[PDB]
């Protein structure tokens, strides 16, 4: 009973590195550094605030998942009478986070870590597990979030290539119209920077990409 408080404070201290790895903050942060880099701006818009705007959307999506943990764990009947039922209770408490990892992680990248951990565990003689586990068996919580964080780096770079495209189509035609004249000794990025800013403010990519990311996890009406 007293050491349940030790387990609470020890969970409390390791919290922001879980937000650093486990949640979807890793999708917003990467694509927001990429929209800064593709525009050519280096310091602005001062990424200390870009962490904050990327954090607030991730909290805005993560709130219904984390809220059921409070109502499940502030129950007055946490304490059971058997040692295996009490260890069963924290599993069925952790299942709402765990199937969230299942929905948004990759299939084979998760599947690679169980085979890699078992041959470390017993030895080479352990036979490999295939895709067909998926209908009944659940993986561990420590074999998911590596393959989760790699799959989300894959999806964030998937998004980051696409809106990198409409700026380099601008950056090649400016470097060609300057060489249509004899203006070879001229820095084309200082002419390219206004029409790079117009193609983002006339298109208004912030207020439709921000809706796009919330549509990639949740729905409306």
């Amino acid at each position: 009973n007293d050491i349940s408080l030790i387990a609470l404070l020890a969970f409390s201290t390791l919290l922001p590195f879980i937000i650093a790895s486990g949640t979807c903050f890793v999708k917003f942060s990467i694509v927001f550094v990429m929209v800064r880099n593709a525009l050519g701006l280096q310091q602005i818009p001062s990424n200390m605030t870009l962490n904050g705007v990327a954090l607030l959307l991730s909290m805005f999506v993560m709130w219904p998942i984390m809220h059921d943990a409070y109502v499940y764990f502030e129950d007055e009947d946490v304490t059971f009478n058997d040692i295996s039922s009490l260890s069963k209770h924290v599993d069925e408490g952790l299942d709402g986070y765990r199937d969230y990892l299942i929905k948004y992680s990759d299939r084979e990248l998760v599947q690679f870590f169980e085979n890699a951990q078992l041959k470390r565990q017993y030895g080479e003689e352990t036979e490999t597990v295939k895709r067909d586990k998926d209908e009944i068996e659940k993986p561990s919580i420590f074999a998911l979030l590596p393959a989760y964080a790699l799959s989300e780096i894959k999806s964030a770079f998937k998004i980051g290539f696409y809106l990198y495209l409409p700026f380099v189509v601008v950056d090649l035609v400016v470097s060609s119209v300057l060489l249509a004249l004899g203006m070879m000794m001229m820095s084309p990025v200082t002419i390219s920077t206004p029409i790079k800013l117009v193609l983002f403010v006339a298109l208004d990519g912030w207020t439709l990409l921000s809706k796009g990311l919330i549509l990639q996890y949740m729905d409306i009406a």
């Binding site: 067909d132 586990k133 209908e135 009944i136």
Partner: peptide
């Protein structure tokens, strides 16, 4: 249907289409 599937034949026959899926046919 029973190429790669495991099934029980006889009186109460069923076909396990998957590790988490049962198929009960009506004869």
């Amino acid at each position: 249907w029973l190429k790669g599937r495991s099934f029980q034949y006889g009186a109460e026959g069923y076909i396990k289409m998957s590790p988490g899926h049962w198929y009960f046919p009506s004869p």
